[PDB]
A = this chain, B = another copy of it.
Amino acid sequence: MALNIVLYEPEIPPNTGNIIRLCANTGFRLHIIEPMGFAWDDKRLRRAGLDYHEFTAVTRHHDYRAFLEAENPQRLFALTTKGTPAHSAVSYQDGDYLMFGPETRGLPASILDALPAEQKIRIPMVPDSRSMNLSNAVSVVVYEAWRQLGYPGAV
């Protein structure tokens, strides 16, 4: 299937490690927009317990513009606490790209402002909550989308 997770300038290695495993366990495709806050090193990756098939599937983009041009996403959603519809309120479809920001910074306003409110998605939280852990946020979105499609590829 054709669902895509995009990490914008991820900073914390274990978050990305968790996300690689997640996408491999679900068949989602993972994209990373450079620069990252860590070395992309096959050794550290296998070191973290990741198999080759898991991390070579990942595609790395030199920057946001390069990503758009390379991927030409059919639809692009941004996950942000400043979003409107819940992640379970959108109907995901093939060719969707779901974008997440860096741990300390979040997504730059410039990228957010170019998207319709309807494509900026907020995972619900209780009032006055602090942000979710990045890999947890990705997990929640991936599994909701996958559920919507009937867990294709899971037996």
A: which residues have CB within 8 A of B?
A: 14, 18, 21-22, 24-27, 49, 51, 86, 88, 123-127, 129-130, 132-133, 135-137, 139-140, 143-144, 146-147, 151, 153-155
**Which residues of chain B come closer than 8 Å to A126, judged between CB atoms?**
24-27, 153-154
Residues of B within 8 A of A147 (CB): 88, 144
- Verify A129–B86 contact, CB threshold 8 A: no
Chain copies in complex: 2
A133 to B135, CA, bound (A): 9
Contact B133 A18 (CB under 8 A): yes
A14 neighbours in B (Cβ, 8 Å): 14
Q: Verify A129–B88 contact, CB threshold 8 A.
A: no
A136–B139 CA distance with the chains assembled, in angstroms:
6
Closest chain B CB from A136 CB (angstroms):
4
A154 engages B133 (CB within 8 Å): no
